Design a protein around this motif. Sequence first.
Motif, PDB file in Angstrom:
ATOM      1  N   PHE A 382      -0.036   0.183  20.969  1.00  0.00           N
ATOM      2  CA  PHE A 382      -0.843  -0.167  19.827  1.00  0.00           C
ATOM      3  C   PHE A 382      -0.323   0.661  18.662  1.00  0.00           C
ATOM      4  CE2 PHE A 382      -4.715  -1.402  17.641  1.00  0.00           C
ATOM      5  CZ  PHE A 382      -5.106  -2.550  18.294  1.00  0.00           C
ATOM      6  N   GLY A 383       0.310   0.006  17.699  1.00  0.00           N
ATOM      7  CA  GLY A 383       1.093   0.737  16.729  1.00  0.00           C
ATOM      8  C   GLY A 383       0.374   0.921  15.409  1.00  0.00           C
ATOM      9  N   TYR A 384       1.007   1.671  14.517  1.00  0.00           N
ATOM     10  CA  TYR A 384       0.408   2.072  13.256  1.00  0.00           C
ATOM     11  C   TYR A 384       1.461   2.015  12.158  1.00  0.00           C
ATOM     12  CZ  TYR A 384      -1.706   5.169   9.738  1.00  0.00           C
ATOM     13  OH  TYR A 384      -2.182   5.708   8.563  1.00  0.00           O
ATOM     14  N   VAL A 385       1.079   1.483  11.002  1.00  0.00           N
ATOM     15  CA  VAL A 385       1.909   1.572   9.810  1.00  0.00           C
ATOM     16  C   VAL A 385       0.983   1.680   8.605  1.00  0.00           C
ATOM     17  CG1 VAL A 385       2.065  -0.937   9.560  1.00  0.00           C
ATOM     18  CG2 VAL A 385       3.727   0.528   8.413  1.00  0.00           C
ATOM     19  N   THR A 386       1.417   2.418   7.588  1.00  0.00           N
ATOM     20  CA  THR A 386       0.646   2.542   6.356  1.00  0.00           C
ATOM     21  C   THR A 386       1.553   2.698   5.149  1.00  0.00           C
ATOM     22  OG1 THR A 386      -1.234   3.642   5.263  1.00  0.00           O
ATOM     23  CG2 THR A 386       0.376   5.053   6.352  1.00  0.00           C
ATOM     24  N   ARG A 387       0.998   2.402   3.978  1.00  0.00           N
ATOM     25  CA  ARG A 387       1.699   2.557   2.709  1.00  0.00           C
ATOM     26  C   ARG A 387       0.821   3.337   1.738  1.00  0.00           C
ATOM     27  NH1 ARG A 387       5.313   1.667   5.246  1.00  0.00           N
ATOM     28  NH2 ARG A 387       7.225   0.467   4.800  1.00  0.00           N
ATOM     29  N   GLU A 388       1.395   4.347   1.100  1.00  0.00           N
ATOM     30  CA  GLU A 388       0.641   5.165   0.154  1.00  0.00           C
ATOM     31  C   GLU A 388       1.177   5.058  -1.274  1.00  0.00           C
ATOM     32  OE1 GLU A 388       2.312   9.498   1.641  1.00  0.00           O
ATOM     33  OE2 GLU A 388       1.102   8.271   3.006  1.00  0.00           O
ATOM     34  N   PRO A 389       0.343   4.563  -2.200  1.00  0.00           N
ATOM     35  CA  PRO A 389       0.745   4.580  -3.611  1.00  0.00           C
ATOM     36  C   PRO A 389       1.095   6.002  -4.057  1.00  0.00           C
ATOM     37  CG  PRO A 389      -1.239   3.279  -3.324  1.00  0.00           C
ATOM     38  CD  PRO A 389      -0.961   3.911  -1.994  1.00  0.00           C
ATOM     39  N   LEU A 390       2.271   6.176  -4.654  1.00  0.00           N
ATOM     40  CA  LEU A 390       2.702   7.484  -5.143  1.00  0.00           C
ATOM     41  C   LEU A 390       2.078   7.797  -6.502  1.00  0.00           C
ATOM     42  N   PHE A 391       2.009   6.776  -7.346  1.00  0.00           N
ATOM     43  CA  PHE A 391       1.522   6.913  -8.710  1.00  0.00           C
ATOM     44  C   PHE A 391       0.263   6.078  -8.914  1.00  0.00           C
ATOM     45  N   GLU A 392       0.408   4.764  -8.745  1.00  0.00           N
ATOM     46  CA  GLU A 392      -0.682   3.810  -8.956  1.00  0.00           C
ATOM     47  C   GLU A 392      -1.954   4.176  -8.189  1.00  0.00           C
ATOM     48  OE1 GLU A 392       0.438  -0.276  -8.260  1.00  0.00           O
ATOM     49  OE2 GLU A 392      -1.426  -1.043  -9.129  1.00  0.00           O
ATOM     50  N   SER A 393      -3.094   4.052  -8.859  1.00  0.00           N
ATOM     51  CA  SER A 393      -4.361   4.402  -8.241  1.00  0.00           C
ATOM     52  C   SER A 393      -4.970   3.215  -7.484  1.00  0.00           C
ATOM     53  CB  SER A 393      -5.334   4.976  -9.272  1.00  0.00           C
ATOM     54  OG  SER A 393      -5.587   4.036 -10.296  1.00  0.00           O
ATOM     55  N   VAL A 394      -5.619   3.529  -6.374  1.00  0.00           N
ATOM     56  CA  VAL A 394      -6.233   2.549  -5.498  1.00  0.00           C
ATOM     57  C   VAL A 394      -7.526   1.969  -6.103  1.00  0.00           C
ATOM     58  CG1 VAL A 394      -7.098   2.232  -3.164  1.00  0.00           C
ATOM     59  CG2 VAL A 394      -5.285   3.875  -3.587  1.00  0.00           C
ATOM     60  N   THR A 395      -7.714   0.658  -5.978  1.00  0.00           N
ATOM     61  CA  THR A 395      -8.989   0.037  -6.334  1.00  0.00           C
ATOM     62  C   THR A 395      -9.550  -0.726  -5.144  1.00  0.00           C
ATOM     63  OG1 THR A 395      -8.215  -2.157  -7.014  1.00  0.00           O
ATOM     64  CG2 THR A 395      -8.047  -0.365  -8.638  1.00  0.00           C
ATOM     65  N   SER A 396     -10.707  -1.347  -5.341  1.00  0.00           N
ATOM     66  CA  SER A 396     -11.357  -2.097  -4.282  1.00  0.00           C
ATOM     67  C   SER A 396     -10.473  -3.240  -3.783  1.00  0.00           C
ATOM     68  CB  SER A 396     -12.696  -2.657  -4.770  1.00  0.00           C
ATOM     69  OG  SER A 396     -13.351  -3.328  -3.718  1.00  0.00           O
ATOM     70  N   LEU A 397      -9.510  -3.662  -4.593  1.00  0.00           N
ATOM     71  CA  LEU A 397      -8.666  -4.784  -4.199  1.00  0.00           C
ATOM     72  C   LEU A 397      -7.612  -4.356  -3.184  1.00  0.00           C
ATOM     73  CD1 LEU A 397     -10.118  -6.066  -6.716  1.00  0.00           C
ATOM     74  CD2 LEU A 397      -8.007  -7.338  -7.105  1.00  0.00           C
ATOM     75  N   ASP A 398      -7.502  -3.049  -2.948  1.00  0.00           N
ATOM     76  CA  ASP A 398      -6.576  -2.560  -1.929  1.00  0.00           C
ATOM     77  C   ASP A 398      -7.184  -2.601  -0.541  1.00  0.00           C
ATOM     78  OD1 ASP A 398      -5.692  -0.631  -4.501  1.00  0.00           O
ATOM     79  OD2 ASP A 398      -4.069  -1.592  -3.374  1.00  0.00           O
ATOM     80  N   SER A 399      -8.496  -2.799  -0.481  1.00  0.00           N
ATOM     81  CA  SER A 399      -9.166  -2.888   0.808  1.00  0.00           C
ATOM     82  C   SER A 399      -8.813  -4.200   1.502  1.00  0.00           C
ATOM     83  CB  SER A 399     -10.680  -2.712   0.662  1.00  0.00           C
ATOM     84  OG  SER A 399     -11.003  -1.348   0.413  1.00  0.00           O
ATOM     85  N   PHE A 400      -8.814  -4.176   2.828  1.00  0.00           N
ATOM     86  CA  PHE A 400      -8.280  -5.304   3.585  1.00  0.00           C
ATOM     87  C   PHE A 400      -9.250  -6.473   3.815  1.00  0.00           C
ATOM     88  CE2 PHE A 400      -4.596  -3.320   3.112  1.00  0.00           C
ATOM     89  CZ  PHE A 400      -4.028  -2.558   4.112  1.00  0.00           C
ATOM     90  N   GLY A 401     -10.458  -6.365   3.282  1.00  0.00           N
ATOM     91  CA  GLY A 401     -11.298  -7.539   3.148  1.00  0.00           C
ATOM     92  C   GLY A 401     -10.623  -8.425   2.120  1.00  0.00           C
TER      93      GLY A 401
END
Lengths: 659, 659
Positions: A382-401
């Motif tokens: 069961f694997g894992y991958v993620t991406r982290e914005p370096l500069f750009e800020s996260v909003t509600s649209l980054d959520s996976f809903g």
Amino acid sequence: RERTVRLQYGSRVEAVYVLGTYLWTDVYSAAPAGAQTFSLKHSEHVWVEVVRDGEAEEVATNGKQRWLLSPSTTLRVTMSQASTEASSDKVTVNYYDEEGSIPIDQAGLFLTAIEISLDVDADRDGVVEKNNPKKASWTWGPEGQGAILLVNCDRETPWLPKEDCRDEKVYSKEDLKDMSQMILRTKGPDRLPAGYEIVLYISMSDSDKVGVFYVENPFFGQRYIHILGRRKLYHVVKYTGGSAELLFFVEGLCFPDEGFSGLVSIHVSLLEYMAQDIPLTPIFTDTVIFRIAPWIMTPNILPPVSVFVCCMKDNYLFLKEVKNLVEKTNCELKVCFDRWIQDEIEFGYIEAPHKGFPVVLDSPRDGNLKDFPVKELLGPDFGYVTREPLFESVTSLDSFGNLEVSPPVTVNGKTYPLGRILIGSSFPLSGGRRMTKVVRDFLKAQQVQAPVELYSDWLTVGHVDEFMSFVPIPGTKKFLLLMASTSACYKLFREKQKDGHGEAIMFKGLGGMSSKRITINKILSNESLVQENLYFQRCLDWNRDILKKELGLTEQDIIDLPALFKMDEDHRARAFFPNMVNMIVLDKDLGIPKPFGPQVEEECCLEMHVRGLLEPLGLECTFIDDISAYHKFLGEVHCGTNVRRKPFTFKWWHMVPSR
Amino acid sequence: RERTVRLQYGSRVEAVYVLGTYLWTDVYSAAPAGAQTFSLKHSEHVWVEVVRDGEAEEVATNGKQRWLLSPSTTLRVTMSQASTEASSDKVTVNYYDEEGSIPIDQAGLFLTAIEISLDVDADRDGVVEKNNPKKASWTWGPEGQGAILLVNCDRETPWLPKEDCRDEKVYSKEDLKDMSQMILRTKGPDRLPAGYEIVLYISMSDSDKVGVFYVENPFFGQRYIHILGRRKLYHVVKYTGGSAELLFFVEGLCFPDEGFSGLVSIHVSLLEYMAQDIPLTPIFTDTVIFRIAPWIMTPNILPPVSVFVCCMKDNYLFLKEVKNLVEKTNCELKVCFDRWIQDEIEFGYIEAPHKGFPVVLDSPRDGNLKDFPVKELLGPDFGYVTREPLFESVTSLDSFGNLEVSPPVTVNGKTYPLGRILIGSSFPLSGGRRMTKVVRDFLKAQQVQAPVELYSDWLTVGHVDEFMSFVPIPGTKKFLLLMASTSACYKLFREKQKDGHGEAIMFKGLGGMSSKRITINKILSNESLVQENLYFQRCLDWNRDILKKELGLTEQDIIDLPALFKMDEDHRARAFFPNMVNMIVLDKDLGIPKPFGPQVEEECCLEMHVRGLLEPLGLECTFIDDISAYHKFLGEVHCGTNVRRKPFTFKWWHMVPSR
Ligand SMILES: [Ca+2]
Ligand SMILES: [Ca+2]
Ligand SMILES: [Ca+2]
Ligand SMILES: [Ca+2]
Ligand SMILES: [Ca+2]
Ligand SMILES: [Ca+2]
Ligand SMILES: [Ca+2]
Ligand SMILES: [Ca+2]
Ligand SMILES: [Ca+2]
Ligand SMILES: [Ca+2]
């Protein structure tokens, strides 16, 4: 493959000959000045042709034939089998001057033939074939070829926190099952001639995309040697004579992404030592290519395996009803004691011919709400991958809903066998919210799900799963797009009012709403609410049109579910009553959020209406109450669910994505 | 393209209809509660179908027909012609309840039809066709389509130092000839209905790849308005009624490169004003794509136009002999009063269907030798492009004597109609020199010349043009690869020695070499020099094999020219006598560096030998002396030449590069 080897004036040349090549040999340069003609002898397993200005003639092992010395008269030398210790493989050239038939000099070429092939399973059947001629390229499609590599992103043993590919070490042999095999096959005599070595290598650039291991079986147990990968660009191979194979195991470290196509290469070269301080000459080089398998999402039409659910321990009705629902099916229920399971994770998968397994994509953390990644699902296969914005800020649209995927579709004759990824966005000139570039770039780079942006930014939370979902049509290969519809809700309420039900109450049994006494009359009379919902219906219809266009859907494929929203200060929508469109889809069985709509004859008119739309199609509806434990509904849902599904039967590598 | 438009309960809807779409219209939601049936009327130029659960039926302008109200009974509405001031385009729906045939209510849709098309020359014939259905995509090949854009890298007027594309301004109308045309074609009534505007736009990402200008003709003269480009992402279009066209001119700012494929997009949308503080809704969007034309290099087989030469003012023999050579041809001679013209610049070209012109690539500056770019060739229809390493330091391998290109070839059945770019490098594991990544990435990104790396790092200067060149075979479509050969030189010297010429002197007439008295005997007796040159011959042969493989050449295609080198402390080679392979190729006429080889019967034996190889093929040899003015030869050449050639007849966009 022709290779140049010159006889040397006055002296003899010793060379390794690699099978699958052939030598063109200059005999003229080594001839003494004044020499007129030459003759040659050669051994049994060396084939020799005299090529005069393009015309080739085979020559016997010991003949007396003579040819004029000319720069344009050369030899072509071929061997079809590797040398053994019993071999003396040679070609000898004798030179003659004008008068006399006795040689005035001779030059010779002593050969050691070996086979060297770096082999991978390029025909994608799971077994490593001998020297596939297409192994150095990678082509898409049913007729396509070239070997495939998994990002080895699961974790074999719990004692370490990190995915298997984060280091240069291998602990458990189970790890090898995730890896693609690469075999260096050689044949030859007891040792390579003096001055040669065989070396595996990769580019600096690929050194963070792969790792390559060799299995040794010393006295005290199996061990795993990291021979290529991070900070190791080459490995000198220990040569063994006779017919030999070295088995290597290759892992991918990195998914395709912006700036990385997914293709990597591994080389083997036979190198010749020239002298100290001078680079070794690659004599022969063989290359194999791998494509790292993309991360793929599963649409609601795929068979459910496990239902992951998150809710507070005391929301009993929710738990009871979800359990009931799941008992109608063969799925496992997994409960964790609250939207994170839907919003923070998307279950995808990866597949190679030899192996496959589910992989979680973890939503970017902002630092406010989510300061920490959720790694607790990382496990064996069961694997894992993620991406982290370096500069750009996260909003509600980054959520996976805000991240979903369509069932397979065909659009204007182009097939999307894996469906298409859908993510909510705003209009291009709007200055509104949009999912982070780093995540969008990632999904786009996977290529096989060809993502489409919808318009979600009219919603306060801003998620596509607030307004749309897909369901299969039982007993068929088809599916329906389900759309939230405010017009359907107003139509229904206006009918019930005409029918004499205007005083019918909503949110019945939610004690925290009772003082509001919200009735059909009260809703229909609220003029500003009507205008807001007409506008929201325009937002829904704009999406409807995009979906019809980009998924190749008609009105026949769509069902509208009554929905209603309230507008906030930003002119964005939030649910007035729970959004029924965002539902648990287990084949024919649908868990639908209980709406708490107006009661008519002691049944919710929203429930009866939804049953009347769906049940005729063979869909069985269970309404799931997640709000009663909270005594009220303000537009937020406190539970979440995510269904882990079986992968598509269609193999991703059989697709032909657009250039 | 189907678009959703709902009648509104009780009230009337006004909409713009864009030609080429059609509307699906919900009449059910606007029907009063309790209504049973509906009927409709519509105007002459509105086509209306009643679609019942998928079955469509055309309806008359004024009939009395009635249909049951159902959510699954809708209208499909089409218009084939734009509205004018004489238009009243409408559909009106009447609703009826159970009893009585008099309408109890009506809802209507008032339409304004307009045509909006953003048009480009996607069929690549130089003229802008109306709404090419393939205009939104870009495909390679003879059957391929989509519009092409030039980087507008020349300079129209001298008064400014910078290439035309470096700003947002246009000065001379001549600049427009370099630009691709894009026309926004519209048709409609005197004005758009209230609440609509038409807007051109580009993405932030493309804003540094293009600029778009509009030509106005006000009172005091033509002016050029920059409507999209750097720091301008959108432009609100002024709408004119009737049948209208707005002509725009598009320039590319940037060549394809690492991270930029070369494709850019331009959009037009009809936007609807919703209300203040709310984004405008794109109603309709049309898109065109451009591919920016790559930089292309010209091989020695292409017709010469101008010979650029650099030498000191007093090297008279060189100038006289180069002038003589060029007089045998129709080429212009351009002289500048010294290797920079060969090393610092490569003449390429760019082409679009409407236009094309030569473009100089300027070699990266180190800060030591070249601290400054050479921009002095920048002019009308003579363009400029350069790449600067940000981090990586420049070496001799970045000089353009290290950058050449093959004639068109076919390799293993794959055609390279533009030839392949060749650049010198070192072996992968060597830790040797390599051309900077930024320049390699650039050449690779052009894609149509599919670059190949050779091995140049055995040479002190490290340039491919030191060891190889191409020449056409007169009276044919074929060409020869010319290779420097030390073995040929030793063979020839050994023959002349055997012939009694061992005391023949080299560098005769170079006063600075006289005290050395270098003879054939002295050369042949130098044992270490022999070994060095055997090794250099291995380096040459390694290249020979790569070239044969990657260019699909046989021994029939190759001629070896005698050469000789001396080794430095790094074990790298420099010319012992001038390298004849690096020669001025003007069709059948070849300027060849004078070797100053051993005199036999008062002729250079190297000259006679080279004539004997080439002249039989119809090649005419002129030996050019660039060293006599210096009185000696230490291995460096003091003059340079570069030939600017006509572009290939084959159009780059007809190629099909590998994915
Ligand atoms: Ca296989
Ligand atoms: Ca590991
Ligand atoms: Ca693993
Ligand atoms: Ca595993
Ligand atoms: Ca999701
Ligand atoms: Ca055209
Ligand atoms: Ca300009
Ligand atoms: Ca210009
Ligand atoms: Ca121009
Ligand atoms: Ca050059």
